[PDB]
């Protein structure tokens, strides 16, 4: 069920990305740029194989998974991790353990935006982006 999930998307608000960098121990001007940053994230699927695109003027990654098997991530900050993807809740759930720590990347869709909610820590940080035509 992650057909509504589906296309392109670009960063329309931010909430608390600093902080959330901050408790990966990303540098200051690594922080500086990404808070500036607007990502374009682009997702598609193809059979039960999606792939997850996100394009800015700083960094650039892309994933591909199968939903509910794991995968091996280089993180846009440079974290080796082991990733899995689910639905849970109609949410598009993206766990990621490293060293024994773990982040979520979780998506749901609010009024048609998809609010990309990054929890690391104590530091939520919560990102609306809207759909591109
Ligand atoms: O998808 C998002 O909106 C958040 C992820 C991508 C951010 C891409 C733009 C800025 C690059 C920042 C690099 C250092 C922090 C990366 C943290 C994981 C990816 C967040």
């Not at 296309?7 to 990305?17: A, E, H, Y």
């Not at 902080?19 to 500086?32: C, E, I, N, P």
């Not at 009024?111 to 919560?126: F, Y």
């Amino acid at each position: 069920m992650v057909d509504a999930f589906l296309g392109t998307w670009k960063l329309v608000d931010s909430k608390n990305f600093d902080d959330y960098m901050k408790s990966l121990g990303v540098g200051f001007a690594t922080r500086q740029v990404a808070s500036m940053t607007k990502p374009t994230t682009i997702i598609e699927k193809n059979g039960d194989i999606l792939t997850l695109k996100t394009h800015s003027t700083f960094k650039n990654t892309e994933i591909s998974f199968k939903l509910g098997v794991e995968f091996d991530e280089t993180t846009a900050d440079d974290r080796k991790v082991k990733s899995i993807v689910t639905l849970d809740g109609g949410k598009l759930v993206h766990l990621q353990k490293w060293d024994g720590q773990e982040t979520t990347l979780v998506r749901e869709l609010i009024d048609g935006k998809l609010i990309l909610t990054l929890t690391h820590g104590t530091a939520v940080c919560t990102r609306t982006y809207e759909k591109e035509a």
